């Protein structure tokens, strides 16, 4: 919500907030209720 979810598993929407720390935004079984799948060390960091 307003800049970035910032949330492993934030239930987001394509056409939304984008995802902040931990990312994806695949939906559930409607594209509304979705999830920014957990991702910190795998989304632009990688070690630190």
């Given at each position: 919500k307003k800049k970035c979810i910032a949330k492993d598993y934030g239930r987001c929407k394509w056409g939304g907030t984008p995802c902040c720390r931990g990312r994806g935004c695949i939906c559930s079984?409607?594209?509304?209720?979705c999830e920014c799948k957990p991702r910190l060390i795998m989304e632009g960091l990688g070690l630190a």
């Open positions: 079984i409607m594209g509304t209720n």
